Structure formats: structure tokens, C-alpha cells
């Protein structure tokens, strides 16, 4: 169970990133000052987000561009609470074992 | 092959709209976003809007007043240019441009010359 | 939205020397900027993307640089097929902007 919910949530995670840095591009344009605008760095500022780095380059300033990044946000973290779990799910077995 | 193709000229009364086109081909990916760019004889390139097709979604140069209205149609990669109730200050060439999503302009058409005129 | 000031609008060189164009951002953009050439009655042609990046098709001859605020497109040995209109334009911030425009004269 563990590592197929793993599994998924990584190939869900790099969905997200994807769709993600595109709905991003689209939310932004159009709004004056906005620089996640165009789509290698939109990649990149989502994958900054996602581990929850955020280093401050790239934000969205939209309603819907900060939609999107909290999608990202939690996607992120939900992937790695669900790898989190699933190691400890594994190690707690080995162990009983040993 | 041409990759942007726009008609040479449109005539256009003061007071009537005109739509103009700009035929795409090449490659062609979600991430294109069409501009239009208005230059005056003599004059500078001035930004009007873009497009993406993919979505459908247009904006517009807030500076300006609004003239314009973009679609695009998927199935004959065409996107157009609504210009409505022009006067001389309409009479310009209107370029259309493709970004590939990454901010520049690697490709513009040749330019549909407008005049307005009775 | 952001300036960009090219300037001087008018830039007389003799045949086979450098010559540069400048380009001032009215805020820092990074080296999101890029050149374009436009001959008489002719449409605008990417020259340099991203402040220093070559284009395929486009001679060697052509260069640029800079960061932040001031940028710079270098011709080495200048010739007549040169002689056209030159235009910077920022994809940094929403919405993209062009510079003036900066035109190219040869003295022969």
C-alpha cells in the first residue's frame, strides 16, 4: 500500500509542477508588475515551492496565481509526508524482523 | 515557410471596425502566446496585446485606449485582431508576433498596413 | 510598467569600426532583455535574446551584454546592410515593453 500511494504521489507531484507552471504563466500575465510570467522559470519557482524552499525570486501577486501556488505548496508536502510515512512503514518492519 | 502570414492592407472608414488575421505554421505548442504590435509610420513598435491560444485568454496594454479584441481559432491556427471604431490615429501597420512562452518575439509577420480613411 | 530609454536615438559610425547601442531599464531586470532589427520597410528581426544569447542566422557580428538596468548591443565592424532601426524589449515584468528605438547611419 505504502509505496504505491508513494509512487503516485510522486508522479501526481511532477503533474503538478508542470500543470502548475502553466496555469501560473496564465494567471500573471496581465497583471502589471507580475514576474512569473514566463514558463522555464514558472517550472522552477514551482519546484521551489513544492519543497517548501522559497526563496523570495518569484511570487505570484494574483488571486488565482496564489491559488495555484497553495495547490503546489500542499502537493509538495502531502508527496513527502506520504515518502515520510512509507519509509517509516518499511524500517518498522525490517525492524520487528531483526 | 512563412510563419506568420497577415494580408498586406485593410481600408477602413472612420467609425467601422476591421478584423485582421495572422495565419499560423510551424511548430506549434500550449505554451505559444500571439502578440500584436501597432507601429506608426515614422514611429516606434508599440505593445497592444497577446493571446494564447491553447486557453483562449487575451490581455491588454493598460497605457492605451482599448481598440483591440483577440481570439484565436485552433482548428486554422488563425488568430485575429478585432479593431473597432477607428479613426486616423488607428492608421498604422499592426504586426503579429510569436513568444514561445519565454518572453521574445522569434518570429513576426510582415505587417497588415490599416488606413482609415473616407 | 517598465521604461526602456534607448538613447542616442541616432548612432553615426564609419564603415568597418564597433559601434553600440544602449539600452536603460527604469528598474533592475535581470538580463531579461532582448534586441531586434528593423530595416526600412521591413519587419523586426530577433537579433540577441536574454542580453547576450546568439540567434541562428544571425552574423557573428553581433553581441550583447549587461545586467540589472543597462544593457549594450555591439556590432564589430559595421557595414552597410546594417544601416536599420534597433529596438530593445523586457519580458521581466508584465507587460512587456519596447525601448525607443535607436537608428544606425554610416558614414561614407
Known amino acids: 500500500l505504502h509505496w504505491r500511494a508513494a509512487g503516485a504521489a510522486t508522479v501526481l507531484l511532477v503533474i503538478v509542477l508542470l500543470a502548475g507552471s502553466y496555469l501560473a504563466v496564465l494567471a500573471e500575465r496581465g497583471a502589471p508588475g507580475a514576474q512569473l510570467i514566463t514558463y522555464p522559470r514558472a517550472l522552477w519557482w514551482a519546484c521551489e515551492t513544492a519543497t517548501t524552499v522559497x526563496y523570495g525570486d518569484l511570487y505570484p501577486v494574483t488571486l488565482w496565481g496564489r491559488l495555484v501556488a497553495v495547490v503546489v505548496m500542499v502537493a509538495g508536502i502531502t508527496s513527502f509526508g506520504l515518502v515520510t510515512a512509507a519509509l517509516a512503514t518499511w524500517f518498522v518492519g525490517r525492524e520487528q524482523e531483526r | 515557410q512563412v510563419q506568420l502570414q497577415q494580408p498586406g492592407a485593410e481600408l477602413v472608414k472612420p467609425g467601422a471596425s476591421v478584423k485582421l488575421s495572422c495565419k499560423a505554421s510551424?511548430?506549434?505548442?500550449?505554451?505559444?502566446?500571439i502578440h500584436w504590435v501597432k507601429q506608426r509610420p515614422g514611429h516606434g513598435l508599440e505593445w497592444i496585446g497577446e493571446?494564447?491560444?491553447?486557453?483562449?485568454?487575451?490581455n491588454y496594454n493598460e497605457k492605451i485606449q482599448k481598440k483591440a479584441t483577440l481570439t484565436a481559432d485552433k482548428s486554422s491556427s488563425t488568430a485575429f485582431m478585432q479593431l473597432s471604431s477607428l479613426t486616423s490615429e488607428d492608421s498604422a501597420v499592426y504586426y503579429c508576433a510569436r513568444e514561445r512562452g519565454d518572453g521574445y518575439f522569434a518570429v513576426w509577420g510582415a505587417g497588415t498596413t490599416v488606413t482609415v480613411s473616407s | 510598467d517598465i521604461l526602456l530609454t534607448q538613447s542616442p536615438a541616432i548612432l553615426s559610425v564609419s564603415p568597418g569600426e564597433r559601434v553600440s547601442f544602449s539600452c536603460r531599464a527604469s528598474?533592475?531586470?535581470?538580463?531579461?532583455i532582448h534586441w531586434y532589427q528593423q530595416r526600412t520597410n521591413g519587419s523586426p528581426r530577433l537579433l540577441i535574446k536574454?542580453?547576450?544569447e546568439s540567434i541562428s542566422g544571425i552574423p557573428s557580428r553581433f553581441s550583447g551584454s549587461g545586467s540589472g538596468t543597462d544593457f549594450t548591443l555591439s556590432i564589430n565592424s559595421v557595414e552597410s546592410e546594417d544601416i536599420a532601426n534597433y529596438y530593445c524589449?523586457?519580458?521581466?515584468?508584465?507587460?512587456?515593453?519596447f525601448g525607443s528605438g535607436t537608428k544606425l547611419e554610416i558614414k561614407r
Open positions: 528598474q533592475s531586470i535581470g538580463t531579461d
Open positions: 524589449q523586457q519580458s521581466n515584468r508584465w507587460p512587456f515593453t
Open positions: 493571446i494564447i491560444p491553447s486557453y483562449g485568454r487575451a
Open positions: 510551424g511548430y506549434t505548442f500550449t505554451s505559444d502566446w
Open positions: 536574454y542580453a547576450s
